[PDB]
Amino acid sequence: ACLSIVHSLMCHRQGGESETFAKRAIESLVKKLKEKKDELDSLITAITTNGAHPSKCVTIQRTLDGRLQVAGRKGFPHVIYARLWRWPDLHKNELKHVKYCQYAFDLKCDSVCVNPYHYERVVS
Amino acid sequence: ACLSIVHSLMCHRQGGESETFAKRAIESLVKKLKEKKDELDSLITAITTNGAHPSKCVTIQRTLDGRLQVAGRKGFPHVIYARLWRWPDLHKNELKHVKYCQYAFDLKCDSVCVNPYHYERVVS
DNA sequence: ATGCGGGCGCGCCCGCAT
DNA sequence: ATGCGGGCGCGCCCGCAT
Ligand SMILES: [Ca+2]
Ligand SMILES: [Ca+2]
Ligand SMILES: [Ca+2]
Ligand SMILES: [Ca+2]
Ligand SMILES: [Ca+2]
Ligand SMILES: [Ca+2]
Ligand SMILES: [Ca+2]
Ligand SMILES: [Ca+2]
Ligand SMILES: [Ca+2]
Ligand SMILES: [Ca+2]
Ligand SMILES: [Cl-]
Ligand SMILES: [Cl-]
Ligand SMILES: [Cl-]
Ligand SMILES: [Cl-]
Ligand SMILES: [Cl-]
Ligand SMILES: [Cl-]
Ligand SMILES: [Cl-]
Ligand SMILES: [Cl-]
Ligand SMILES: [Zn+2]
Ligand SMILES: [Zn+2]
């Protein structure tokens, strides 16, 4: 079910973390997008094609402090998913959202875009 | 400050738990009663005299599920403090509140009485 | 049907760097 | 002044006993 989607997204991880951390991060994301068909499809299409064709926002609700907790660890959610699918060595203040992204973390919306192809890497 | 109150209440623990668990449980309780002078005085007087002279209710806010967490462990708050100051071997369904107790756990109020001398031990 | 009981995240907290 | 960052509790969840 969601397990087959998680496995397909797992195939595109960059190895910056353990298999078990990546699994928990992907499971957490897929569960939030379960009742949001359009956002889930935009995520699978963006990850599966390695952001070949422009994709739409993939959002989750922002926490009060901005960090998302996965398997006991807290990090910014857009950073967690960009590290996982694009830049395994990604550090803080190294992301810049694309002009068309309407729910980017920096835009201070209760909905945060975690589409890794909605961000580009910059020098800190 | 609250540390001197915690030490005086610690002297009356029955040893059912570790020194460190008892300390965390007492610290948590004292902190909640810090801005409730009358309730804190009723607690110190009841514990210090071993419930010699009738005491008034000592309440904390009830959680949605009824259990209080102290140092990673969950238990009913009236049970935690009765185990700590009166019955170290206390088990579930072995407590019965006194007729004058208005905030007893069984009375389903958002305020729970944790005065151990507001309960008496019964057979389960 | 109803509750226990334990895993784990978000909210609160607070010490610390800058 | 402002934010990081990690500890820990209450809320949510869910498997399980009864
Ligand atoms: Ca559990
Ligand atoms: Ca701190
Ligand atoms: Ca600190
Ligand atoms: Ca400081
Ligand atoms: Ca610091
Ligand atoms: Ca900490
Ligand atoms: Ca469960
Ligand atoms: Ca279970
Ligand atoms: Ca069952
Ligand atoms: Ca069970
Ligand atoms: Cl990874
Ligand atoms: Cl890891
Ligand atoms: Cl969400
Ligand atoms: Cl951003
Ligand atoms: Cl004890
Ligand atoms: Cl113990
Ligand atoms: Cl309280
Ligand atoms: Cl009761
Ligand atoms: Zn976006
Ligand atoms: Zn009472």
Numbering used by the authors:
A (entry chain A), B (entry chain A): 15 to 138
Task: Provide the authors' own sentences about this structure as they appear in the paper.
The best diffracting crystals were obtained with DNAs of 16 and 18 bp. A complex with the 18 bp dsDNA oligonucleotide containing the GGCGCG sequence from the GC1 Gsc segment yielded data at 2.05 Å (refer to Methods section and Table 1). In the complex, the convex face of the DNA-binding hairpin dives into the concave major groove of the duplex DNA containing five base pairs (6-GGCGC-10/9′-GCGCC-13′). The orientation of Arg81 is further stabilized by the interaction of Asp79 side chain with the guanidine site of Arg81. In addition, Lys88 side chain is also well defined through interactions with both G7 and G11′, the latter being located in the complementary chain. The Gln83 side chain carbonyl interacts with C10′, while the amide part is in the proximity of the C9′ phosphate. The complex is further reinforced by a set of hydrogen bond interactions between the backbones of Leu78, Gln83, and Ala85, with G11, G9′, and C10′, covering the 6-GGCGCG-11 area and by a network of well-ordered water molecules, which are tightly bound at the interface of the protein–DNA-binding site. Ten of the water molecules are closely coordinated by residues of the β2–β3 hairpin and six bases of the GGGCGCGC region. Additionally, five more water molecules strengthen the interactions of the N-terminal helix α2 with the phosphates of the DNA backbone.
The receptors for TGF-β, nodal, activin, myostatin, and other family members are membrane serine/threonine kinases that phosphorylate and activate Smad2 and Smad3, whereas analogous receptors for the bone morphogenetic proteins (BMPs) preferentially phosphorylate and activate Smads 1, 5, and 8. These receptor-activated Smads (R-Smads) form heterotrimeric complexes with Smad4, which is required for the transcriptional regulation of most target genes. The structures determined here reveal that the β-hairpin is flexible and adaptable to bind with high-affinity several variants of the consensus sequence GGC(GC)|(CG), which we refer to as 5GC SBE.
